[PDB]
Write a protein that binds this ligand. Structure first.
Ligand SMILES: Nc1ncnc2c1ncn2[C@@H]1O[C@H](COP(=O)(O)OP(=O)(O)O)[C@@H](O)[C@H]1O
Ligand SMILES: C[C@@H](C[P@@](=O)(OP(=O)(O)O)[C@@H](C)N)C(=O)O
Ligand SMILES: [Mg+2]
Ligand SMILES: [Mg+2]
Length: 306
């Protein structure tokens, strides 16, 4: 019987394997909840044919450029297919950490001190005063590609001596890079589903930072849901995250990453518009604590599609 939902997974970004795992999860969750869901991989299928195929809605489970940057949402807007998550502007804006930062800081929101570099400036040689602005950040510092996820392309540099290799790795993934002040932690994440914010999660990695391996591969990562903060701080977290969410213009569902620093204040890291839904993912963890089943959450996200 009529009513086909397309579940977009895989893709070609550096987050492809993670996305196939998020898709597998969502496909079962949706079917368990009575939905006639179909797995569609844009690397295999021409998604520009989604409408000619009979699909009524699209559940986006892609991660990274191509699925979270607004291009895919742009097409679906012209094709007329309701879809999950944020619109074109919010998605394009959330993917770019340098631009989410300008926006956030411009709105008065807490963002860690940073320096942006383009591959060109890097190739030409860092005009030494470049280093003067980077050393003013203090050490250590964190280097990250502007448009990535899953800790791809990042690294920590203790002392200016290590900066070159770090920048060379980051520029392999993007032409625009950020170098930001290293925050002490702990680290937090806060998921949003519609007009509601789920209970906070505090992440605790075994190594240097929450890397690729700590996110999807090791059983050493600890999580605490709720965070364990006093109501006063738990309150401050939601207020911040909600303002971060609305300034960006996001909607549907998402997850914002935050961290504490030595001055006892919260700092925005980034916002993700199409979060992971694998067995190691944070969003499913928060919903569980909020009393929902994996099926319920997924079914709810699709309910929010527009
Ligand atoms: N300024 C920072 N200071 C300390 N750790 C950071 C900082 N920025 C990022 N991290 C760490 O790096 C991880 C990944 O960075 P994030 O900005 O959230 O990008 P991604 O989209 O790859 O997740 C974070 O979860 C955290 O563990
Ligand atoms: C660990 C996290 C990953 P992810 O949602 O977010 P990050 O950008 O922080 O990795 C990612 C897919 N883009 C999760 O699946 O919940
Ligand atoms: Mg991210
Ligand atoms: Mg993150």
């Amino acid at each position: 019987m009529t009513d086909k939902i397309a579940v977009l997974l895989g893709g070609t970004s550096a987050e492809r394997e993670v996305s196939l795992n998020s898709g597998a999860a969502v496909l079962a969750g949706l079917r368990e909840g009575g939905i006639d869901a179909y797995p569609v991989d844009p690397k295999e299928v021409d998604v520009t044919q989604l409408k000619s195929m009979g699909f009524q809605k699209v559940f986006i489970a892609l991660h990274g450029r191509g699925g979270e940057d607004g291009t895919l949402q742009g097409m679906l807007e012209l094709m007329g297919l309701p879809y999950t998550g944020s619109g074109v502007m919010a998605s394009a804006l959330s993917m770019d950490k340098l631009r989410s930062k300008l926006l956030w800081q411009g709105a008065g929101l807490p963002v860690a001190p940073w320096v942006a570099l383009t591959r060109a400036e890097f190739e030409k040689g860092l005009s030494d005063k470049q280093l003067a602005e980077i050393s003013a950040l203090g050490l250590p510092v964190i280097v990250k590609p502007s448009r990535e996820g899953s800790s791809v392309g990042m690294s920590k540099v203790v002392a200016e001596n290590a900066l070159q290799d770090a920048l060379r790795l980051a520029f392999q993934h993007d032409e625009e890079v950020l170098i930001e002040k290293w925050l002490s932690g702990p680290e937090f994440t806060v998921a949003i589903l519609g007009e509601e914010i789920l209970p906070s999660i505090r992440i605790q990695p075994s190594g240097t930072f929450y890397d690729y391996e700590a996110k999807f591969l090791s059983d050493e990562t600890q999580y605490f849901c709720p965070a364990g903060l006093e109501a006063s701080q738990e309150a401050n977290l939601q207020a911040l995250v909600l303002k971060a969410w609305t300034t960006l213009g996001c909607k549907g569902w998402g997850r914002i990453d935050v961290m504490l620093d030595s001055d006892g204040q919260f700092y925005l890291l980034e916002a993700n518009t199409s979060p992971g839904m694998t067995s190691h993912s944070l969003v499913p963890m928060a919903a569980r604590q909020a009393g929902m089943s994996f099926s319920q959450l997924v079914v709810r996200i699709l309910e929010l599609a527009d």
